[model samples]
Target chain A: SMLPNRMALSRQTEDQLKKLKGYTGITPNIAARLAFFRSVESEFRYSPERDSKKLDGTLVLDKITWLGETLQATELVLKMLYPQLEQKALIKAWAAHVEDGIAALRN
Target chain B: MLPNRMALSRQTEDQLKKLKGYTGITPNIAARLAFFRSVESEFRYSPESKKLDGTLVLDKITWLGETLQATELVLKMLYPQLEQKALIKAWAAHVEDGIAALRNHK
Candidate 1:
């Protein structure tokens, strides 16, 4: 029942999105979804029922908002699992996936 | 280098070979990816030294070398400052996790 009500874009993620836009007219919403897909481990499957229930403000742009929301949920889950190491490598993995996801989408 | 052997299950070997063919990555590389994927998210990998301890064959040294090379390439991109020992440990954990994942695959 705990759903993400917001999505925060880091300055670097924003800049990455700018570069990604050159490859496609991908909106931030879609980019966020791609980032989430990239970050999620195969063990954790995305659930529409659980991942699609929270959207509050200007954050909800399209039906695909759930994609980014689910990604936020995954991040929180990883934080709980490895709090100490979360700062160490979680963001690094996430950022890598964001770029990787864009390239995947471009191809 | 200390010679070591890591056993894998028949199912896992089959899956890895199939994936290797599909993705053009070797079984070693595929297993390495699986191990990393197993760790970064959440999933229940199969138990080791149990159902998967005796069925398959892997030259642990060669497999490990492949994993090491791949892990280094990845870490350089993601955690370039990470020490060699730490990277080795990470690769070990990820391969264990990857093996477990293959065991649990249905």
Candidate 2:
């Protein structure tokens, strides 16, 4: 229990958003959705402000049950956006971070 | 950078302000200073939205430079803010990171 509820999910998405701040979403669609109106606000181009705007802009998280306590879990369904850019390598990397955050929470 | 202009001092202040976003000032402080308003937003004084982030002014980046494991920054000029000071231990665990950032531009 390092992360309570959907804290793991939030952290994962936040970190991903941080990485995506400067990355082009060509091969990584998740990065694209987070870059809304990024060009117009050039100062926020490579900053956390992009994702922070949307309430729960981090990702779609679902609540789960754990140890008799209701908990939240992040599905990290980045594909809700342009699912066409489903690159295996990129998805795998994203999964690793999500899993790592979840495992840390469980322990 | 030789400065012999009327607005030279203001230009220097603007450059410092640009870089100030990350240093000494807290994240929300910038947002507050931008616009002054008196309104209760949806997120304030709530039960769920409990935690937020805070920024620490570890040190300021100044006109001068320091080597890896040694850096210096000029503190805010306005003093007497009831500050609790401590000893400065200048050491960079990741020297290469700082070196790389500085090299990118200069």
Candidate 3:
């Protein structure tokens, strides 16, 4: 009895994981932001300081497509507890999330 | 004196005339739509556009820094006249009503 029930549970878990991964792969904001940056860069030339500030200011909470997904509350909680070795790791970590989201959307 | 005033008035009118051409050669919607389409195509190619998000991101939807610039007067007028087709083309144009509105912000 337990064996059949466990197999059903495993199948359910696998499907859920697949759905989560698929949903997390699209990044509309990043795509739009990339376009915005390219336009600004071509128009105003490259002032790194000005561009960085402009980008941050222009980008607001609403502009982000997948906020909850990006935040990943549980992951943040876990990271706080574990404390990673590198300080810059968070930025790189977000790229994986962004890429995943973009992939999901594309598919 | 009248001639001088006429010349001044003509010059002022001439300057005003030159100002109405933001979206003529330098349309942001065109630029943005171009970018959007290119990205869409590269990511999701299709024979019948199986992956493109939008068919058209008309010129009226030009984003300028913060606000969108377009011929609001012409838009309101054309919306009633054309209902939607002329309105759609109105989306293709911009008239100069709010140009100075940008500079006065900061």
> lDDT: which candidate is best?
1
Ranking by lDDT: 1, 3, 2
Of the pair 2 and 3, which is ahead by lDDT?
A: 3
Query: Per-residue alpha-carbon lDDT of model 3 for B23-66, expressed as tens digits?
Result: 12123322232223223222322122112123333333333222
Q: What ranking of all candidate models by TM-score puts the best one first?
A: 1, 3, 2
Give me the runs in candidate 3 sitting further than 4 Å from their true place.
Answer: A1-27, A30-82, A105-107, B1-61, B65-106
In terms of TM-score, which candidate is stronger, 2 or 3?
A: 3
DockQ (Cα-based) per candidate? 0.01, 0.01, 0.01
Candidate 1 local lDDT, B7-100, one digit each (tens): 5555666766654332234467556556665555564322132234435445655665655555556656554555543444444445555644
- Candidate 2 lDDT over residue span B1-84, tens digit each: 101111112322343344232222222222221111111111111122111112222222221123111221111111222122
Q: Which residue pairs overlap in candidate 3's backbone?
A: A24-A101, A25-A100, A25-A101, A25-A102, A25-A103, A25-A104, A26-A101, A26-A102, A27-A102
Per residue, candidate 1 scores C-alpha lDDT tens digits across A1-107 of 22233233334444456556545676555666666566554443322233222212221122223254465565666566445543424434443444445444444
Mind giving the per-residue lDDT tens digits that candidate 2 earns over A22-85? 3433211233222322322232212222232222222222122111121111223333322443
* Count of clashes, each model: 1, 1, 9
The true-versus-predicted C-alpha distance at residue A88 of model 2, in Å, is: 30
TM-score of each model, in listed order = 0.31, 0.17, 0.21
